[PDB]
Write a protein that binds this ligand. Structure first.
Ligand SMILES: CC(C)CCC[C@@H](C)CCC[C@@H](C)CCC[C@@H](C)CCOC[C@@H](CO)OCC[C@H](C)CCC[C@H](C)CCC[C@H](C)CCCC(C)C
Ligand SMILES: CC(C)CCC[C@@H](C)CCC[C@@H](C)CCC[C@@H](C)CCOC[C@@H](CO)OCC[C@H](C)CCC[C@H](C)CCC[C@H](C)CCCC(C)C
Ligand SMILES: CC(C)CCC[C@@H](C)CCC[C@@H](C)CCC[C@@H](C)CCOC[C@@H](CO)OCC[C@H](C)CCC[C@H](C)CCC[C@H](C)CCCC(C)C
Ligand SMILES: CC(C)CCC[C@@H](C)CCC[C@@H](C)CCC[C@@H](C)CCOC[C@@H](CO)OCC[C@H](C)CCC[C@H](C)CCC[C@H](C)CCCC(C)C
Ligand SMILES: CC(C)CCC[C@@H](C)CCC[C@@H](C)CCC[C@@H](C)CCOC[C@@H](CO)OCC[C@H](C)CCC[C@H](C)CCC[C@H](C)CCCC(C)C
Ligand SMILES: CC(C)CCC[C@@H](C)CCC[C@@H](C)CCC[C@@H](C)CCOC[C@@H](CO)OCC[C@H](C)CCC[C@H](C)CCC[C@H](C)CCCC(C)C
Ligand SMILES: *C/C=C(C)/C=C/C=C(C)/C=C/C1=C(C)CCCC1(C)C
Ligand SMILES: *C/C=C(C)/C=C/C=C(C)/C=C/C1=C(C)CCCC1(C)C
Ligand SMILES: *C/C=C(C)/C=C/C=C(C)/C=C/C1=C(C)CCCC1(C)C
Ligand SMILES: CCCCCCCCCCCCCCC
Ligand SMILES: CCCCCCCCCCCCCCC
Ligand SMILES: CCCCCCCCCCCCCCC
Ligand SMILES: CCCCCCCCCCCCCC
Ligand SMILES: CCCCCCCCCCCCCC
Ligand SMILES: CCCCCCCCCCCCCC
Ligand SMILES: CCCCCCCCCCCCC
Ligand SMILES: CCCCCCCCCCCCC
Ligand SMILES: CCCCCCCCCCCCC
Ligand SMILES: CCCCCCCCCCC
Ligand SMILES: CCCCCCCCCCC
Ligand SMILES: CCCCCCCCCCC
Ligand SMILES: CCCCCCCCCCC
Ligand SMILES: CCCCCCCCCC
Ligand SMILES: CCCCCCCCCC
Ligand SMILES: CCCCCCCCCC
Ligand SMILES: CCCCCCCCC
Ligand SMILES: CCCCCCCCC
Ligand SMILES: CCCCCCCCC
Ligand SMILES: CCCCCCCC
Ligand SMILES: CCCCCCCC
Ligand SMILES: CCCCCCCC
Ligand SMILES: CCCCCCCC
Ligand SMILES: CCCCCCCC
Ligand SMILES: CCCCCCCC
Ligand SMILES: CCCCCCCC
Ligand SMILES: CCCCCCCC
Ligand SMILES: CCCCCCCC
Lengths: 231, 231, 231
């Protein structure tokens, strides 16, 4: 395990996701409100899935070698397995907060699936120049998602409770900033142009992942917006 | 890319799915009705997914070699990745049109999953005679789906709005004819008996795919059946 | 096929799932009640999926070799493909019976996904001692599911119809006993410590699978709890 310099960040990531999972699990024990239960379920599952995939990367299972540029390049494929399930759960948290219509939710989840799926294909593609074609398609799917979060959701939040409108606005802003960093790190890291070494890349993704999951969850689950308006 | 004679049909397929995706995306921009949004979301996602998988076939990612009959046989596995997601979306379009009950929708999607999954296993099976066992099981799942579309849905459409009944009937008929061709092409093509060469097989699937997705979508999204009855 | 001593149990399993599938399919033909249709759909799909995966194991497709302990160890990976889809369907049968809230259903299905997914990783892991780390995480996800079935569902059933409360209690008890055997068989069988040989392991899983699917389904589909209260 320690044979890879990036192991320290995989281990820290595993620990922080594990701790985040346990914290949300305990916190949600005292919850009976049916609406709050939905948000706790979604939000606890996110770091639990990430915990398993960080562990698989730490132990070496979630790593494969991909030939491109005349080299055997270490590619952590387990990231995409994580993201396939956790990024639509994160979007679902946002969509339920603002009572999004079903068509909009399906558009978001579908675009998200395309985003992660094409990122996976790009990560595993052996023809170097083609990796960036997949990156571009994935990034276009991301831009669609960000567009919807701003010009379909923000003006939906404003007709809702003030506490859900303010909580949505904060989580929207956190999401757009954090999620936009992922394609940049991929592009300059070992999957793309290879300018930033894998150990630093792994650190960067770990900070983004913990912030986008445990950070996000801490903000959401401390808000009164997750509860039905009750006396 | 041009090293494979079937590349021209993969390229045309990619282009037509891409163009179809953009057309539906633009067309749905001016839509606020919650019901119509569902149909636009579902129907736009279908060629978008197909676009990505056609591209993966064009660039060579979605192709693998399978030993059977003492030969290395080129198998485009990306078709099944496409179909796994797009065929239940197509069925969902039909089921929502007639306000199908939840049990029926689950039966359809489940049978569809079995249909595509067993087709994938058959496509990748190395014992030649066993490929046709999987083809038979998949075809039985197809026949179940077609049965339900006729003797569970058609008589559901008739108690609904005339515009939804007439639109459903047309899309049902398009679906049954087009979908029934797929097992025949598989059986006589490079996956099955090998009587029709891969380049012609690829052409045939491209025509079926564009018709079943973009053709289907053009009929559906031009109907007033996708809108709630409103003043 | 007969080259593997466990083939007889794979063949019997295939037959019993096939027969169970046909029986439930015929039985549900005379059903119009929308609630009952949901239970028939879910419950018929379960042995149908299991039938396909038992067949893939019989024909040899669903088997791979995994190096650990200095040996090439036969691992039937198709079990996890089965279980990935059938265990959440089984939980859905239970959850719908007691009209579980959406948050609880998502927690169950999510924990179940983690349970099966980590079992799959453990089954395919090449570092022997690490296989048991994945077994432990999977078992913890199982224990969460069993906890919810007892201390979240049982007291939900009691405020419902007596026929649904009594049917739920029986199916809950069947589920907890049968499902708890699976991690034990894995641990002592060819995936784990290797004390019980593969042919006996295969027998054990076949008895558990038929009981947990066809047995379970026979109890559920003969109950009046699956019908809406109607005059
Ligand atoms: C009911 O609605 C609220 C339940 O949501 C909360 C439900 C949770 C989503 C349940 C899912 C967590 C499972 C229990 C997962 C089990 C293994 C976890 C990964 C635990 C890992 C952390 C520990 C090992 C440090
Ligand atoms: C509604 C939304 C969910 C829409 C989803 C959007 C989605 C369509 C976007 C594209 C997803 C698609 C790229 C998934 C591809 C998975 C694939 C990378 C798995 C690895 O297999 C690739 C090659 C080795 O590089 O296998 C070597 C050759 C092997 C023989 C491969 C044969 C097995 C195939 C992988 C079977 C395909 C199954 C499905 C792709 C399962 C989806 C997995 C998940 C990653 C989407
Ligand atoms: C809101 O409900 C309506 C939105 O549906 C319409 C929503 C669409 C389903 C959004 C999904 C499309 C994504 C934007 C996919 C991005 C890449 C596409 C494959 C674009 C490819 C076509 C172009 C490259 C020729
Ligand atoms: C409700 C509905 C959705 C019901 C669904 C119906 C469904 C059950 C029908 C059968 C689906 C099943 C056949 C999927 C099999 C996928 C498999 C072909 C992927 C390729 O792996 C096959 C071999 C190489 O040929 O791998 C070589 C050996 C490798 C070590 C394989 C180990 C990895 C396994 C593939 C893990 C299994 C994961 C699940 C099958 C994911 C499902 C993918 C999708 C195609 C259904
Ligand atoms: C409508 O709601 C009730 C339908 O549920 C019942 C619907 C069923 C879930 C339909 C799914 C079964 C498909 C017809 C599967 C076809 C192949 C089966 C595996 C048949 C195998 C058994 C036989 C070959 C012995
Ligand atoms: C809401 C709930 C559903 C939550 C779900 C919980 C879930 C997160 C729990 C963990 C699931 C995760 C372990 C699935 C891993 C599948 C993996 C074993 C498939 C086989 O690939 C493993 C190695 C060979 O051993 O591939 C060799 C290297 C290859 C290059 C691998 C590259 C292809 C990757 C497999 C692509 C990943 C796609 C997704 C994992 C699809 C999920 C399949 C299913 C088994 C969950
Ligand atoms: C918890 C994990 C999260 C929130 C991950 C988010 C990841 C993305 C938004 C990834 C986006 C990518 C692209 C837009 C193109 C390049 C490849 C990706 C997959 C890194
Ligand atoms: C957009 C793509 C569509 C609508 C594809 C539909 C495909 C089918 C109905 C495929 C059916 C098959 C069988 C019935 C058995 C042989 C294998 C298949 C998968 C080709
Ligand atoms: C129809 C099949 C059923 C109901 C299978 C149930 C399987 C399980 C509950 C498996 C559990 C496992 C663990 C808890 C850890 C070890 C690995 C598994 C996957 C066997
Ligand atoms: C969105 C953030 C992307 C920028 C990442 C900056 C990383 C700087 C680290 C120094 C680069 C290491 C190069 C020498 C090894
Ligand atoms: C459902 C349509 C299946 C029939 C396809 C007919 C294809 C005819 C093309 C000629 C066959 C090529 C054989 C000589 C290369
Ligand atoms: C939950 C049941 C696990 C116990 C399984 C008992 C199997 C006993 C069979 C005898 C073991 C075979 C060892 C000699 C080959
Ligand atoms: C490819 C995996 C996509 C599914 C991820 C799980 C999250 C799905 C959330 C469903 C949202 C509800 C839509 C109506
Ligand atoms: C194996 C992939 C199956 C899921 C495909 C995505 C479409 C699912 C549509 C869900 C229909 C709603 C059922 C209640
Ligand atoms: C990884 C596969 C998980 C999906 C299995 C299919 C069963 C899903 C049942 C959905 C229950 C409804 C939740 C709201
Ligand atoms: C186009 C929608 C406006 C809100 C999205 C902001 C786009 C940020 C760009 C992210 C950088 C990705 C490379
Ligand atoms: C049995 C349901 C009647 C409607 C379905 C028509 C079946 C068409 C056969 C398709 C050919 C597949 C090989
Ligand atoms: C902790 C919840 C109480 C009900 C679950 C009973 C646990 C049975 C243990 C199963 C054995 C697995 C190794
Ligand atoms: C070796 C790099 C070749 C450049 C490929 C860039 C493609 C980016 C596509 C953006 C439309
Ligand atoms: C393919 C990228 C699309 C980003 C711009 C959004 C187009 C308008 C969509 C309106 C729902
Ligand atoms: C080499 C071909 C052997 C014939 C197999 C046909 C099987 C079809 C099954 C239909 C019930
Ligand atoms: C070779 C076996 C080494 C023992 C590993 C047991 C790990 C079990 C983890 C339970 C917390
Ligand atoms: C509760 C702490 C969980 C941390 C387990 C994984 C950390 C890796 C240590 C090497
Ligand atoms: C908008 C046109 C999209 C076409 C891109 C793929 C066509 C392949 C050209 C070689
Ligand atoms: C209807 C009987 C189904 C049995 C088919 C599979 C049994 C395997 C026989 C070798
Ligand atoms: C993006 C950083 C999130 C910070 C989380 C802090 C949570 C405290 C309530
Ligand atoms: C099956 C062929 C479909 C033809 C689509 C034409 C759409 C015009 C409205
Ligand atoms: C766990 C054993 C189940 C027994 C099923 C018998 C069904 C008869 C109604
Ligand atoms: C990591 C366990 C958290 C302890 C409880 C925190 C207050 C709910
Ligand atoms: C008003 C919300 C500001 C949140 C910005 C957080 C940036 C990481
Ligand atoms: C809305 C601001 C987006 C900031 C992008 C930051 C990418 C590192
Ligand atoms: C391909 C872009 C379509 C242009 C608009 C068509 C009329 C909505
Ligand atoms: C009355 C609907 C006829 C549609 C037939 C289309 C055949 C491709
Ligand atoms: C309902 C008519 C079906 C026609 C099947 C055509 C197959 C090529
Ligand atoms: C296996 C076929 C079952 C025959 C009908 C049983 C009574 C519904
Ligand atoms: C009162 C329900 C008892 C069911 C026990 C079944 C054990 C296999
Ligand atoms: C509730 C009793 C569980 C019995 C476990 C049996 C495991 C073989």
């Amino acid at each position: 395990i320690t044979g890879r310099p990036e192991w320290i960040w995989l281990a820290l990531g595993t620990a922080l996701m594990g701790l985040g999972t346990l914290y949300f699990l305990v916190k949600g024990m005292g919850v009976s409100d049916p609406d709050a239960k939905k948000f706790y379920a979604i939000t606890t599952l996110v770091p639990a899935i990430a915990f398993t995939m960080y562990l698989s990367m730490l132990l070496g299972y979630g790593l494969t070698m991909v030939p491109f540029g005349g080299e055997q390049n270490p590619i952590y494929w387990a990231r995409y397995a994580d993201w396939l399930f956790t990024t639509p759960l994160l979007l679902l948290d946002l969509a339920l907060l603002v009572d999004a219509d079903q068509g909009t939710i399906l558009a978001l989840v579908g675009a998200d699936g395309i985003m992660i799926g094409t990122g996976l294909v790009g990560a595993l593609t052996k023809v170097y120049s083609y990796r960036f074609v997949w990156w571009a398609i994935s990034t276009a799917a991301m831009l669609y998602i960000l567009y919807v979060l701003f010009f379909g959701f923000t003006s939906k939040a404003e007709s809702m409770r003030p506490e859900v409108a303010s909580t949505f606005k904060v989580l929207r802003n956190v999401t757009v900033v954090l999620w936009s960093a992922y394609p940049v790190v991929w592009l300059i890291g070992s999957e793309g142009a290879g300018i930033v070494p894998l150990n630093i890349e792994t650190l960067l993704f770990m900070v983004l992942d913990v912030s986008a999951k445990v950070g996000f969850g801490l903000i959401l689950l401390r808000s009164r917006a997750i509860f039905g308006e009750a006396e």
